[PDB]
Each structure stands twice: as structure tokens, then as C-alpha cells.
Amino acid sequence: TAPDWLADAVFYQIFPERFANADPSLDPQNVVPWGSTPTPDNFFGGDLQGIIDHLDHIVALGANALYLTPIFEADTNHRYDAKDYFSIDHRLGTLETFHALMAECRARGIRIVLDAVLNHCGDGHWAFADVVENEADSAYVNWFSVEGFPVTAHPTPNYRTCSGCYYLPKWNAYNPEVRHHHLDVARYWIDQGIDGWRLDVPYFINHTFWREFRTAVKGKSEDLYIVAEEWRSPVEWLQGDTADGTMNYTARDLILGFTADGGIDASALAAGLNALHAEIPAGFHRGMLNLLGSHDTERVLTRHAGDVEAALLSYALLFSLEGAPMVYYGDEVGLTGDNDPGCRGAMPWNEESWNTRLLDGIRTFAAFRAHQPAMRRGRQTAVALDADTIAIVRSGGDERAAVIVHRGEGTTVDTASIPLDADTVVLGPLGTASLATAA
Amino acid sequence: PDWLADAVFYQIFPERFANADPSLDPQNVVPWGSTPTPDNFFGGDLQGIIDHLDHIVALGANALYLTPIFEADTNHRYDAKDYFSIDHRLGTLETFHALMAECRARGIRIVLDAVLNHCGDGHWAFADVVENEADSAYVNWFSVEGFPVTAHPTPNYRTCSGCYYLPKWNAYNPEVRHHHLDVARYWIDQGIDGWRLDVPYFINHTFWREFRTAVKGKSEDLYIVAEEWRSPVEWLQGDTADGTMNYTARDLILGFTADGGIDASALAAGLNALHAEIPAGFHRGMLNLLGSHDTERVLTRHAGDVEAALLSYALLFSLEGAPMVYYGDEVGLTGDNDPGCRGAMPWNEESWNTRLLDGIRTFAAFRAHQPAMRRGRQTAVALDADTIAIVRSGGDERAAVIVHRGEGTTVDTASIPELAPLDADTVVLGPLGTASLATA
Ligand SMILES: [Ca+2]
Numbered sequence A: 001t002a003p004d005w006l007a008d009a010v011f012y013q014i015f016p017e018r019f020a021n022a023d024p025s026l027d028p029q030n031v032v033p034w035g036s037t038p039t040p041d042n043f044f045g046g047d048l049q050g051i052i053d054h055l056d057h058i059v060a061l062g063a064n065a066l067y068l069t070p071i072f073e074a075d076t077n078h079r080y081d082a083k084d085y086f087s088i089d090h091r092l093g094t095l096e097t098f099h100a101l102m103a104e105c106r107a108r109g110i111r112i113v114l115d116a117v118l119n120h121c122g123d124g125h126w127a128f129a130d131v132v133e134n135e136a137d138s139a140y141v142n143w144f145s146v147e148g149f150p151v152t153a154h155p156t157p158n159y160r161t162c163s164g165c166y167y168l169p170k171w172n173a174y175n176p177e178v179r180h181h182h183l184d185v186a187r188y189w190i191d192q193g194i195d196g197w198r199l200d201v202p203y204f205i206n207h208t209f210w211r212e213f214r215t216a217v218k219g220k221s222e223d224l225y226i227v228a229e230e231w232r233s234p235v236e237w238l239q240g241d242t243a244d245g246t247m248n249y250t251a252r253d254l255i256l257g258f259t260a261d262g263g264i265d266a267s268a269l270a271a272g273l274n275a276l277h278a279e280i281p282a283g284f285h286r287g288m289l290n291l292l293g294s295h296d297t298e299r300v301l302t303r304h305a306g307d308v309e310a311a312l313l314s315y316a317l318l319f320s321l322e323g324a325p326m327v328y329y330g331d332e333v334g335l336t337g338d339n340d341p342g343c344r345g346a347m348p349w350n351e352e353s354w355n356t357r358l359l360d361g362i363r364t365f366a367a368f369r370a371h372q373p374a375m376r377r378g379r380q381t382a383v384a385l386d387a388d389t390i391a392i393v394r395s396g397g398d399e400r401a402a403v404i405v406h407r408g409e410g411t412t413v414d415t416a417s418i419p420l421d422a423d424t425v426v427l428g429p430l431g432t433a434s435l436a437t438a439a
Numbered sequence B: 001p002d003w004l005a006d007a008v009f010y011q012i013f014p015e016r017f018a019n020a021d022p023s024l025d026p027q028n029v030v031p032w033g034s035t036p037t038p039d040n041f042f043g044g045d046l047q048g049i050i051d052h053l054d055h056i057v058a059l060g061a062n063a064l065y066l067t068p069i070f071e072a073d074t075n076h077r078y079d080a081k082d083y084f085s086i087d088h089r090l091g092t093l094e095t096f097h098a099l100m101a102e103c104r105a106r107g108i109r110i111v112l113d114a115v116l117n118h119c120g121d122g123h124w125a126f127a128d129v130v131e132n133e134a135d136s137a138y139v140n141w142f143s144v145e146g147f148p149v150t151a152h153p154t155p156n157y158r159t160c161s162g163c164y165y166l167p168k169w170n171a172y173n174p175e176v177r178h179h180h181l182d183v184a185r186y187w188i189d190q191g192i193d194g195w196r197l198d199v200p201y202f203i204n205h206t207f208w209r210e211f212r213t214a215v216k217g218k219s220e221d222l223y224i225v226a227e228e229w230r231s232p233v234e235w236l237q238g239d240t241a242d243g244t245m246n247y248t249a250r251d252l253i254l255g256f257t258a259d260g261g262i263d264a265s266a267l268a269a270g271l272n273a274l275h276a277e278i279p280a281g282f283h284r285g286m287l288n289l290l291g292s293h294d295t296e297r298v299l300t301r302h303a304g305d306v307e308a309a310l311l312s313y314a315l316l317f318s319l320e321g322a323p324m325v326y327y328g329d330e331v332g333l334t335g336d337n338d339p340g341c342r343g344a345m346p347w348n349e350e351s352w353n354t355r356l357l358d359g360i361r362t363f364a365a366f367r368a369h370q371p372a373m374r375r376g377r378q379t380a381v382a383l384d385a386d387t388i389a390i391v392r393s394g395g396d397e398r399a400a401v402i403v404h405r406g407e408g409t410t411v412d413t414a415s416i417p418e419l420a421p422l423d424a425d426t427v428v429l430g431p432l433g434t435a436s437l438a439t440a
Helices: A004-008 A048-052 A055-061 A095-107 A126-137 A176-191 A207-220 A249-261 A266-279 A308-320 A356-371 A373-377 B002-006 B046-051 B053-059 B093-105 B124-135 B174-189 B205-218 B247-259 B264-277 B306-318 B354-369
Strands: A011-014 A065-068 A072-074 A082-088 A111-116 A196-199 A225-228 A289-291 A324-328 A379-386 A389-395 A399-406 A411-414 A424-427 A432-438 B009-012 B063-066 B070-072 B080-086 B109-114 B194-197 B223-226 B287-289 B322-326 B377-384 B387-394 B397-404 B409-412 B426-429 B434-438
Touching (some): A004 A373, A048 A095, A055 A356, A082 A095, A095 A111, A176 A207, A196 A207, A207 A225, A249 A266, A249 A289, A249 A308, A266 A379, A266 A389, A308 A356, A308 A399, A308 A432, A356 A373, A356 A399, A356 A432, A356 B409, A356 B426, A373 A399, A379 A411, A389 A411, A411 B354, A424 A432, B046 B053, B046 B093, B053 B354, B080 B093, B093 B109, B109 B174, B194 B205, B205 B223, B247 B306, B264 B387, B306 B354, B306 B387, B306 B397, B354 B397, B397 B426, B426 B434
Parallel strands (some): A011 A065, A111 A196, A196 A225, B009 B063, B009 B322, B194 B223
Antiparallel strands (some): A072 A082, A389 A399, A399 A432, A411 A424, A424 B434, A432 B426, B070 B080, B397 B434, B409 B426
């Protein structure tokens, strides 16, 4: 089963090169102004000290865990092209600054999850450059799958890669020495104090390796959290031998279908959510990392086409579900943008730039979850009341809660219709209601 | 009258609601979008009111308060020149009859403006005194100091508030009373359901007792509501009105939802006091409102904050007494105080704030559906400096509208004796959040 702390977790995902530039002396020569349009090649100077300095913002939102995208020495702004998995990227800070982040995080009750990019590294990585250089004489030739020498990125890479990208050579995970390096990466950062690992494109490697991964990570501690990136069904990762959960892109698509697209009505959503619930095995519901967006999607508000009230319906649903809810940095203040690089805009720190009522609306849903124990540990039941209105009921030992979410122009619901209370509740246009009762 | 318990009012300033008949339009009529002024005409008409009853009903209203509609020489029609005719730009008596019929067909009631302290300087009686002086048969229908009559400097006759074009009726003349009682009787014969009293404080209670007797004599269920900006207590002794325009409740609500000057304790106390001052049987007759043709528009009072504005509406619709919506506020029209608040009502729905409209409708629908929200006692309860419950209880049934002006909070239903009977133990309120719950 998944670790129990997860029931209480609320995650804040950070793309560190865009959250806060606290240290200009770390910035590269070609650093762009903080207000610039994000691109696949530009750098803003976001750093680890920037995260430390805004921990208060992250706490005040209701978050108690961070998911960090890659932070190790790389040549891109997203850092999926790691070149040394054993140091912090020199533009993010040093190992000391990283330690200071861990400590400041744990003084405030905040757990840390890093991004484990094990299918591939960057072409700048020492082992890969050694192969380029020394070819068949490199000791790390078999750390990759290079077709022949000389190595060429032109016209198509003559080595295996992540989805054809020339600067992301694929790690040969069939090599024991590569697995040992991958496991020493897992343990090393756990030795530095992290609380879990998020797995990047885990489906490009293989279950056998991910089994060794769980054994190495859980061997250090049973409460370290492993979460699979997965866009389709999560079930393969929830058999008890690989991950503790999945990024719940299934719930994302269902929720947004309802609140933003209008393609699915409340009945299809409830059915979608009850089935995903049936699909996910016992012990693993708690481990699902639910989200409405990420660094791999367009921003939630953009998906809702600037309709902040509808967007609040999404968050209501998000915070209502079993699984740890995750907010993507800047969505809480109403940032907009298309898919990558559009969703990787720099986070503004002028409170006059924030959509404050969006922030307070999300804070409210988070606060009700944190205060009501059934919202964290209770059972999840989804029920349609009409085409535009859904109730997410959560059933605790000694208490029960419901979040009722209406996307129409207003209605009333008889709670006697939802299997403790016989109240009538009214919902305004784009309205929600959040109710609890002693059992 | 009992029917006031279920009444919801929609106030129309008839010049500005809807212009259905261009043939009625005056010569220098302005475009419908234009800025209102003390002299301009837009051509709003009675047929335009008939044509838009749908919108009124969809709002949830079942009663109109109309401002004066008799023949006059201003855009506001407070300067009546003939009390026994519809103003020629509004329509004819026939059209008026048609509006009544249509209204009766939808269970809508009608309330007109009784402007009895004064008429207009163009009124036939006044012009006859101006012409024939001491030989006019109507010299004592007014208070003219002497001849020739002059406005020039300042009127050498009594007026409403110094205004030369609004000479004051001598209500001490039985002929003038007779005339006033014929006006009340005449429009009641034309199908009308009641009267709003314009500045009744400028006349006297002896006159308003006769007024009541004549009106109630036609039918006990005809409603009488007095304009009063201060305490309403003097109008509620059983001998004059059935209620007043509740400007006291307005000042309290807006001080809390818009100004920030009054907190929830002070608002709860204010409302509880007002309630206790209102005599038994008269709570329902109170005509509750957030604004009128004599105030700046609600949304403008809330500095354009729609969510703040919706807190006002929630409160308004939660109170005992008949709630009234000033035409166009439901769609988010803005405006300063008169003339600014007499904008023409746009009918192109792309200009409306429809979340505001549907917000108001929801409060109305809750109230229409809950018997306690109409006939139940009223207890106002401060929970926080920023959060108030208005509770309504029918014997053992209970409704509650909870209204939060802060950034978000939680309402523990237990430990609040008046909220305790709801099965829900906790209720969340978002920022500027509203919660409406009812028992059983
Ligand atoms: Ca007209």
C-alpha cells in the first residue's frame, strides 16, 4: 500500500527556473527579464533560494508537499537533459542551498518530491560525451544504445533517444552498471533528505527495472513516496511492486470535460470517477496525485477560457477527491498560457498581479479539506443530482462530508437525496457548497 | 394585507424601462443609450412594460412599484398636471388597462405613486389661479401669499422644497381632499392594487387616516406603503400605511456590504432593533430595498464589485418584508444619484451581467420556495466581524441565509442555538461567499 502521510498531502508543483529568482549572481549571461514570454530555450534565473523565500506563500495556500521538476545539472531550461545526476544545477544553487531548502521545508511541515529522469540524460552528460569522444574505447559505450561511430545527431540521431530528440540519449537500462547508477541516484538524494520520487516517462523503461527501484527506495524507508507519470490507465503501476500512485491525468480529463469543455455531463463524470475508483486497487487511492494541470499541459484558466468561476469548479472537484491534490505553480493566482512553453510563465510576486479571489477560493477548498478528516481519509463516492450538478461524498468513521459542484445558472439540492442530513441547499450560478456532519 | 408576505417588487421609472411605441415619442427624444439628465426624454412607455413582463417574472417579481405615470411636464412626472390621465407619452388609458389585464393574467400586482403634497405648475387648477387670481375658484386649493403669483425671485406660494414648479396642495381644503380621495378611488377602479405615498411627512396624519379609510373601504387587501427615510414607526400604528420603504435596512446593509463602516455585530443589532420597533402585523408590509430613483445605483455604491453587490441582495432577500429590485440593478447597471440612476434599461443581453441576474434569481427562488422565508420570524445573528446569519423560522421549520464579506470562513452550526436544528454541522463560505440552507 501507499504511505499514510499521503492522505494528508497537498502538493505544489514547481518548475524551478520560473518560480523565483532570489539570487541574480547565479543567473546566466543570457538571462531574460522576469516578464518575458517563456520559450523552449530561454532562462529567467529562477533558483532554489527563490523557493525558500516564498515558502510562506506555499504554506498559506494550504500546500505541504512540493513536486519539483528536474533540478540536477543540465543544459536546458526544463533540465530533462541531466548531465550529472549528483549535483544541483549550478544556476539553481549549490548543495548547501539545497540543504537549506530541505531544512526550511521540514521546519514548516513541507515534504519534497524530486523528478527521476531515468530513461534518458542529456547529450552533455559526462558518460555520453565520453562515448562521443572515445567511441568503442569508452568504458560507458554500453551505458547507451549507439548504433555506430561516429556519433551523429545529424541527420537523425544514430543512437536511441527519448522520442527522437537528439540531445536526450536513451539510457541503456539493460546494463547492470546503468541500473547501479540509477539506484545510486535514488539513494543519494534520499540520503540528502527527500521524501519521494516522481518517475518521468516510466513507460519507456520496463517493470522489471521499476521493481528494483521500489526495493531500493522502500529499503531505505517504507514511507518514501514513488509516483508514476502516466497519462492513460494507472492500473499497471498499482500492483504493489512499482509505484505508490500515478499522476491522475484520468481525473484531470474527466473534471475538465465537465467544468471547461461541456463535453461530459455530471452523470458521465460520476461514472468516470466511480469507475476509476473501482479500477484503482485498495491501498493505492490515497497515493494518486490528482491535478488539473502541469508543465505538460496548458494552464487551467486558459483551458477554461478566462472564466475564473468555472475554473473554481475544477478546483472544488480537485480538492474533493481521494488522492493528494496538486496545484501547479501560478494557477492559484490565475496565470494563463497554452501548453509548453506557454504554461512555464514566470510567477509574479506583485500581489496586484494576482487574481486574489481565485487564490482565496482555492485556499477555502484546501482549508475545508485540511480541517475535515473524512476529506483526507474518507471513502469517495461520486453522484450526479442532475446534468449540471455533482456531489462528491467522502465517508469517515465518525463524520461525513460532501462537496457539491454546479456548473449551471443555479439550483437547489435536497441532501436527503444523497446517501445524516435532510437539509435543502441552494447553489448559485457556478456555485459550490461544502458540508460536513457528525456520524 | 397577507399577500405582501409572498410579494417581490420590481421598481420601474416608466420613462426609461422600454420604448415599444415610437408614435408616443416626444420631438427631442434622445437615443436609448444616452446619459440621463433632469430634462431629457427617452420615450419609455406602458406598452414597453407589457412587452417585457417576461423578464420581470423570470427575475422572480410578482409586483410592480411604478413611479408617477400621470400627465406631467417632466421626465419624472412628480409635477402632475392632471391626475385622471396617463401621461400622453406613456400611452392611453386603454394601454393602461391592457397592462393591468396582462399583469392580472400572470399574478402580478401593481402599485402607483401618489403625489399628493404637491402638483405641477402646469396643473389646470394652478394655471387657473395664476390667470384669475382671487377670482379663480381654485385659489384656496393652494397657498398663494398674494398676487400676482411669482416664481421669479423665490415663489410667493408654498412648494415642495422651494421648487417653483411644484406648488404645494392645500390639504387643509376639503375640496382638495375630495380631489385626492377621488384620485385614489379612481385608479383603484381602473384595476390598481395599491399606492406608494410620496413624501407623506409633508402633509399630516389626519389626511393619511382619511386616505387609509377610503382605500381600505374599496378593499382591505389594497396596499399602502409610505416613503420614509428615517424611522418608519409613525406610519405603522394601524391608522395610516401598511409599511414603508425601508431605507433604514438599506443603510445598514450597505454600510456592511459596501462601505465597511459597520461590522456584522452592528448590522445584526441594527436589524434586530428595527425589527423590534416594527409593530406586529406590519413586518411583512415593509418594502425592503437597496436603492431607488432617489439613490445612486447599488453596483456603483459597491464601487463596481459584483460579488460584494450580491451580498447586499442575499441580505435584502433574506429579510422579513417584501424585497424590491430597482429596474436594471439585476443586470448591473451603474449610475450615481438622480439623475445618474435613471439610465434607460438595455435589452441587448450581451451588455448584461447575467451571473449577477442569475445570482439574484437564485435568492428569489430560495425565498419563494421556503415558507419561512416569507412568513417566518426574523433573527439576525453576527458570527464574525465579517459574517452574519439571517435566520427565518416557521414554528419548528427554519431557513438561514449566511453572508460572508471576508476571504473565507467556516460556520459551526452547533453552538449557534438558532442555526442548531440544521442537520449540517459545518458549512463553508468562500470569499464573498453566500450560503442558503433550509431545514426539513
Ligand atoms: Ca415611446
